[PDB]
């Protein structure tokens, strides 16, 4: 489906250090490619994917300066939130922001988003028109009025329809051989005689990209989801992902069951059995 570029900012206050820490990571689809961490004497934006590293000095300088500016804006945001909620200066709090753009079939913005959370609760979000805000709570209603007076949503709209889409297009080209290639899962079924009267069959999908996958078990074509254990999809460590789904079947009845693997990298969905 549609490709996207997104960033994820996490700011935490640190009353004991008298400061705040600001971390920002960027992703194209399911692939991280940049980071910034404010907790260094001379912090710089840094590459976290091999294909971004060819960017010139001017790319790195711009991103580093945005990050330094963000670290200050989020330091102030943490103090303003503490004030809105009349919270103690004793405690650490967390403010997160995520925003990004999805690319449409004509190479223009399909959908842009931009939103925040404080201590994990929704705070404020940019609307569909990209020119206005929806507040989740009362403090964010005061933020909303200040931001309408600022008018900065016009410049965020400009970014999401412009630079966000234009840079995503560039990253897709630079990393095309991984970012625009669906890597199919390598699969197998294992068997673990478990119980006096049960055998565990586990259906694995290893090394797949992107993250979206469907693993299901059937008994003679009938879905077994209510009885299967399905683990959360997890990174392989090389930029791909893994997942498994297991279920206990009666002894001697392995031939009655199939695992169905559906992933965009496959030529065809797989039907696997313990053979």
């Amino acid at each position: 489906g549609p490709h996207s570029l997104s960033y994820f900012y996490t700011a935490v206050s640190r009353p004991d250090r008298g400061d705040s820490r600001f971390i920002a990571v960027g992703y194209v689809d399911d692939t991280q490619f940049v980071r910034f961490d404010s907790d260094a004497p001379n912090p710089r934006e840094e590459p976290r994917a091999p294909w971004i590293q060819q960017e010139g000095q001017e790319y790195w300088d711009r991103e580093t300066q945005i990050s330094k500016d963000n670290a200050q804006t989020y330091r102030v945001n943490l103090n303003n939130l503490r004030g809105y909620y009349n919270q103690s200066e004793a405690g650490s709090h967390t403010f997160q922001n995520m925003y990004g753009c999805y690319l449409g079939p004509d190479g223009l913005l399909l959908h842009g988003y931009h939103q925040y959370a404080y201590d994990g609760a929704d705070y404020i979000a940019l609307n569909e028109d990209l020119r206005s805000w929806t507040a989740a709570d009362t403090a964010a209603q005061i933020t909303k009025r200040k931001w309408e007076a600022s008018g900065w949503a016009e410049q965020e709209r400009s970014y999401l329809q412009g630079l966000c889409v234009e840079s995503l297009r560039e990253y897709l080209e630079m990393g095309k051989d991984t970012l625009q290639r669906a890597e199919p899962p390598k699969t197998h079924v294992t068997r673990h005689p478990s119980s006096d009267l049960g055998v565990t069959l586990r259906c694995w999908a290893l090394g797949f990209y992107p993250k979206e996958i469907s693993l299901t078990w059937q008994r003679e074509g009938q879905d077994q989801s209510q009885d299967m254990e399905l683990v959360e999809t997890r990174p392989s460590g090389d930029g791909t992902f893994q997942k498994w789904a297991a279920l206990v079947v009666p002894p001697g009845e392995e031939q009655s069951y199939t695992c169905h693997v559906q992933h965009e990298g496959l030529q065809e969905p797989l039907t696997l059995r313990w053979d």
Binding site: G26, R62, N70, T73, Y99, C164
Partner: peptide, 9 residues
């Protein structure tokens, strides 16, 4: 490439 954010909450 990142957006520019200067407007505190």
């Amino acid at each position: 490439k990142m957006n520019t954010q200067f407007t505190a909450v």
